[PDB]
Design a protein around this ligand. Structure first.
Ligand SMILES: [Fe+3]
Length: 53
């Protein structure tokens, strides 16, 4: 699985760590995250994210 980052703010989603405070457990592929989950830092949605390489 790949990290994704928010291209509006730098927030890196790391699949290893999930985002547990918002319901996304460790091991959750970004593409498996609920499409109504927001960047925990800027409060925008998945669509401002891109795959990291
Ligand atoms: Fe963001």
């Amino acid at each position: 699985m790949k990290k994704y980052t928010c291209t509006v703010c730098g927030y890196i989603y790391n699949p290893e760590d999930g985002d547990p405070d918002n319901g996304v457990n460790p091991g959750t592929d970004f593409k498996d995250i609920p499409d109504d989950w927001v960047c925990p830092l800027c409060g925008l949605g998945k669509d401002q994210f891109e795959e990291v390489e």
